[PDB]
UniProtKB/Swiss-Prot annotation, chain A:
Protein name: Flagellar basal body rod protein FlgB
Its job: Structural component of flagellum, the bacterial motility apparatus. Part of the rod structure of flagellar basal body.
Cellular localisation: Bacterial flagellum basal body
Keyword Glycoprotein carried by entry: no
Organism expressing this protein natively: Salmonella typhimurium (strain LT2 / SGSC1412 / ATCC 700720)
Major localisation: other
GO biological process: bacterial-type flagellum-dependent cell motility
Gene this chain is encoded by: flgB
Source species, domain of life: Bacteria
Classification via Pfam families: Flg_bb_rod
UniProtKB/Swiss-Prot annotation, chain B:
Protein name: Flagellar M-ring protein
Regulation: induction: Inhibited in nutrient-poor medium.
Function comment: The M ring may be actively involved in energy transduction.
Portion of the full-length sequence here: 256 to 305 of 560
Superkingdom classification of source: Bacteria
Subcellular location: Cell inner membrane; Bacterial flagellum basal body
SUBUNIT field: The basal body constitutes a major portion of the flagellar organelle and consists of four rings (L,P,S, and M) mounted on a central rod. The M ring is integral to the inner membrane of the cell and may be connected to the flagellar rod via the S ring. The S (supramembrane ring) lies just distal to the M ring. The L and P rings lie in the outer membrane and the periplasmic space, respectively.
Family label: Belongs to the FliF family.
Positions in coiled-coil regions: none
Amino acid sequence: DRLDAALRFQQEALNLRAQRQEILAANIANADTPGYQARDIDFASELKKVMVGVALTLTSSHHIPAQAVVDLLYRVPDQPSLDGNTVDMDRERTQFADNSLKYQMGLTVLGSQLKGMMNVLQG
Amino acid sequence: IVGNGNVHAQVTAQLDFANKEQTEEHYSPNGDASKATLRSRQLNISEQVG
């Protein structure tokens, strides 16, 4: 559908921001686990990958339709801890706040596009 | 062989005067993968060994 193509980029950006938000909050929650590595995703490359499948064929009514079913990069440690935990509070707190801001911005842009498509139709 | 008049026979017949109509449907079994005909197949396999 053409409607999907217009809203594909912002939807994928919003979903990627939510996933990275979950990853950052997981990094915050597991700050005290000894031996836990701080993981993160490269937002731009994954957004390229998602932006850049074959529903199985249903011959009749009984035939069952096809059933549907990111890469994590390690953060470079800054300070060496003794328990092997590489999670840094300041870095991930700033990243968490930034991801929240960008999620809000994506919501704003997507809502503006939908509202414009709506006022085009209203009449 | 027996001769004219040296044989007598009589026949009785139970007949069928009942109108019957029948429709039969048969499906060939496809439980064996060798004789199974397929149109679409989705096989998702995952093995996360730790």
